[PDB]
Write a protein that binds this DNA or RNA. Structure first.
Length: 200
DNA sequence: TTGCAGTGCCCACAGAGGCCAGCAGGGGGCGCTAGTGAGGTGGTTTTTATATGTTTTGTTATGTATTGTTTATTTTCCCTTTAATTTTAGGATATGAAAACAAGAAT
């Protein structure tokens, strides 16, 4: 599977033949970890090389996040982090962005890699320029916390405490400054909201 | 001839005015000199100015140290597979302790 995953990574225009489709699906639901990470790595390489036409299989991809393994979840986090970082405006990002913070407390290693993943993804210093990037960053955060209400809020604040404890010394306080750089901007958003109540 | 009334003449002493030396008035022209005043020349220094030597400043080139870069050998996190290692009966041992027997002792 790993080798033929490299093969289809070279040539994405083969992932239509039905018997290999049955085989890769069976290895997704095979009773072993290593085949599962090989198959999800195949699908993730297909997704990164071909952003389109894989969203029909995105439901299987997003249900492979929870696999009771160790490296399978690291691999699927890498896949979804690269999906998030390379194509914005995908219609099911924020719902996606919910599910892995639900797994931040699961293991110590996942806790780490997710923490710096989102810290590079969201909580960067962002100097005084490029207002629109900060703007739809704020928009994405609001969509995440809005989709957060049905299940529960404790996971994301636990993530916040994970970032808080991670910098026990000064270390320039990179998120911390950015933290206040967020909140007044949200106040600024409120300052420009002025009138839609779901976003409020 | 005389007395009286009136005239002539001579002198003389002031009386008068020209003559004269003496003397004082105003201004003309020269003999000579003390004392500045100014102008010109020479000396001195001095002051500006000019040129030379030394040093200071500015520019250039080389070497060392610092930061960055793709390797590159750790290294370390994560699998599937054994190699001790542990736990649970199951049988056998042992060492004890009553139990029975045999041996003094008494009645």
């Amino acid at each position: 599977m790993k080798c033929l995953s490299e093969v289809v990574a070279v040539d994405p225009s083969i992932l239509a033949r039905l018997d290999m489709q049955r085989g890769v699906h069976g290895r997704l639901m095979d009773n072993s970890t290593s085949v599962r990470e090989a198959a999800v790595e195949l699908l993730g390489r297909f997704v990164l090389c071909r952003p389109q036409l894989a969203e029909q299989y995105y439901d299987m991809l997003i249900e492979r996040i929870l696999d009771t393994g160790i490296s399978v979840r690291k691999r699927v986090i890498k896949i979804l982090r690269d999906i998030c970082i390379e194509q914005p405006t995908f219609p099911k990002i924020t719902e996606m962005c919910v599910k892995m913070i639900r797994r931040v407390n699961d293991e110590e290693g996942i806790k780490k890699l997710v923490n710096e993943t989102f810290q590079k993804l969201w909580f960067t210093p962002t100097p005084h320029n490029d207002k629109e990037a900060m703007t739809r960053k704020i928009l994405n955060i609001t969509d995440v916390v809005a989709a957060c209400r049905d299940t529960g809020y404790d996971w994301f604040e636990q993530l916040l405490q994970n970032l808080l404890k991670s910098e026990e010394d000064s270390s320039y306080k990179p998120v911390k400054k950015a933290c206040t750089q967020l909140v007044d901007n949200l106040v600024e958003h409120i300052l420009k909201y002025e009138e839609n109540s779901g976003r409020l």
